[PDB]
Amino acid sequence: RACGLIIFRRCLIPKVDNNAIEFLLLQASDGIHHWTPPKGHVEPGEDDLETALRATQEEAGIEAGQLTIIEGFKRELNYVARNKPKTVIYWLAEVKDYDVEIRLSHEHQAYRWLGLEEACQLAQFKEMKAALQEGHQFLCSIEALEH
Ligand SMILES: [Mg+2]
């Protein structure tokens, strides 16, 4: 069981930015070299949301001071990879600074910041595509209500 954060940043230059929202994806060092948001396994006694924050720090080098958790969104994924059952819980979190320093560990070899459509294509897997699309939809609905 793993928990993570769908990390995004806002791109607020109106004529320029094709995508007002970009998602952070990390590419695995091993295996297929899958692309996912930052995530990590739970620890005994650890709250699921604290695991997601901790795993984001460990996998992407993003500290709690550099993020804001967006309340109201949570998505649990259940899938089979290499004939093993997998469960992952994601929350949404916005980075404070567009230029936040991404520091990878040995578990990942690259990162991309991508618009929703390109993030979906890289993520590839259908549950992860759904979760990113649903996260994007939630962010737009929230903006509308505050607007
Ligand atoms: Mg805790």
Side-chain angles (χ1 to χ4, degrees), residues 45-51:
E46 219 182 26
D47 182 279
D48 278 2
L49 181 54
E50 181 51 44
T51 302

Side-chain angles (χ1 to χ4, degrees), residues 78-93:
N78 302 275
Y79 54 101
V80 183
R82 304 177 162 198
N83 269 314
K84 307 224 149 182
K86 198 39 206 289
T87 299
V88 191
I89 319 284
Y90 287 105
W91 282 260
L92 273 166

Side-chain angles (χ1 to χ4, degrees), residues 26-57:
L26 311 181
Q27 180 182 40
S29 279
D30 57 8
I32 306 184
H33 308 306
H34 278 117
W35 292 87
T36 77
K39 65 174 157 74
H41 66 89
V42 302
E43 291 272 9
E46 219 182 26
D47 182 279
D48 278 2
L49 181 54
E50 181 51 44
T51 302
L53 286 156
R54 189 199 99 235
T56 298
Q57 167 273 295

Side-chain angles (χ1 to χ4, degrees), residues 72-143:
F73 183 86
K74 174 157 72 141
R75 170 69 207 247
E76 180 184 293
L77 290 65
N78 302 275
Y79 54 101
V80 183
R82 304 177 162 198
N83 269 314
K84 307 224 149 182
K86 198 39 206 289
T87 299
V88 191
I89 319 284
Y90 287 105
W91 282 260
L92 273 166
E94 193 175 345
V95 300
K96 255 65 161 61
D97 298 336
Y98 183 94
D99 76 342
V100 59
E101 184 183 11
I102 301 301
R103 296 246 268 162
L104 302 173
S105 72
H106 74 279
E107 285 183 44
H108 300 94
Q109 57 182 43
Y111 73 89
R112 300 284 178 271
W113 284 109
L114 299 163
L116 177 61
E117 176 53 41
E118 303 204 65
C120 287
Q121 298 179 292
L122 254 201
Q124 219 213 352
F125 174 47
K126 70 176 192 276
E127 235 99 28
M128 174 54 42
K129 281 170 41 188
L132 295 163
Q133 285 163 5
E134 285 158 15
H136 194 269
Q137 185 175 36
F138 170 82
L139 294 168
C140 296
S141 78
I142 294 316
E143 289 156 33

